[PDB]
Design an enzyme around this catalytic site. Sequence first.
Site, mmCIF file in Angstrom:
data_model
loop_
_atom_site.group_PDB
_atom_site.id
_atom_site.type_symbol
_atom_site.label_atom_id
_atom_site.label_comp_id
_atom_site.label_asym_id
_atom_site.label_seq_id
_atom_site.Cartn_x
_atom_site.Cartn_y
_atom_site.Cartn_z
ATOM 1 N N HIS A 71 34.914 28.745 40.250
ATOM 2 C CA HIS A 71 33.480 29.026 40.254
ATOM 3 C C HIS A 71 33.017 29.661 38.951
ATOM 4 O O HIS A 71 31.805 29.802 38.748
ATOM 5 C CB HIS A 71 33.095 29.892 41.465
ATOM 6 C CG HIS A 71 33.431 31.348 41.330
ATOM 7 N ND1 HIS A 71 34.576 31.901 41.864
ATOM 8 C CD2 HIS A 71 32.741 32.372 40.777
ATOM 9 C CE1 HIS A 71 34.594 33.198 41.611
ATOM 10 N NE2 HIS A 71 33.491 33.510 40.953
ATOM 11 N N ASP A 95 39.638 27.674 44.762
ATOM 12 C CA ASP A 95 38.803 28.297 43.735
ATOM 13 C C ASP A 95 39.646 28.675 42.521
ATOM 14 O O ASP A 95 39.500 29.759 41.955
ATOM 15 C CB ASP A 95 38.071 29.520 44.286
ATOM 16 C CG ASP A 95 36.929 29.971 43.393
ATOM 17 O OD1 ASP A 95 36.522 29.193 42.503
ATOM 18 O OD2 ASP A 95 36.442 31.107 43.579
ATOM 19 N N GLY A 151 31.849 39.860 37.614
ATOM 20 C CA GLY A 151 32.441 39.528 36.338
ATOM 21 C C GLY A 151 33.929 39.771 36.241
ATOM 22 O O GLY A 151 34.499 39.591 35.157
ATOM 23 N N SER A 153 36.192 38.347 38.608
ATOM 24 C CA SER A 153 36.962 37.238 39.156
ATOM 25 C C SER A 153 37.882 36.676 38.078
ATOM 26 O O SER A 153 37.541 36.643 36.892
ATOM 27 C CB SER A 153 36.046 36.139 39.691
ATOM 28 O OG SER A 153 35.321 35.515 38.651
#
Length: 193
Positions: A71, A95, A151, A153
């Site tokens: 993502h 993801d 911010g 991830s």
Amino acid sequence: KKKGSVVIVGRINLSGDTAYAQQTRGEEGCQETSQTGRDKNQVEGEVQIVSTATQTFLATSINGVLWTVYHGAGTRTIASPKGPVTQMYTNVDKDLVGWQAPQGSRSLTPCTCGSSDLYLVTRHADVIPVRRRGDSRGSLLSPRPISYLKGSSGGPLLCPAGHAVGIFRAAVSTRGVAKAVDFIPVESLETTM
Ligand SMILES: [Zn+2]
């Protein structure tokens, strides 16, 4: 038009007694490097701060692969000294994306400790204690607004010995307060590999 490359813009330094973020490229150089895909900056360390034209997040080297979240990166290449590098792993169901680890980086070792006392490393170099609660979940010992995790991830969850236990993926919040985190376990990385 063509979408730009992911660009390494800094790192989280974990080499000493204090953790701190370092920036290695400014916004102007980032936008140019994203268009060309040519990044000649020297890379160091385990946790990179990365950016696209529109988003910034983290990427973590484990077992010779620089891992981050779909993502954030989508299917984008990453900028390198010889030009854009295509993803080596892509799994939207997890993801998860990954490229070959950059020359000069250091890789975290996958955890085999089986410990549930973890530490989340954020883009602001906060080291946040997290109690593992499942294969992909851990609770914050001290909750805090999701703003503080945005911010981060692609950043790592570490065991007490500094092994990689997982990759930060999503925040579990109630009324804007993060109480838990969702992460890609390193075993899921090791299987994908
Ligand atoms: Zn360990």
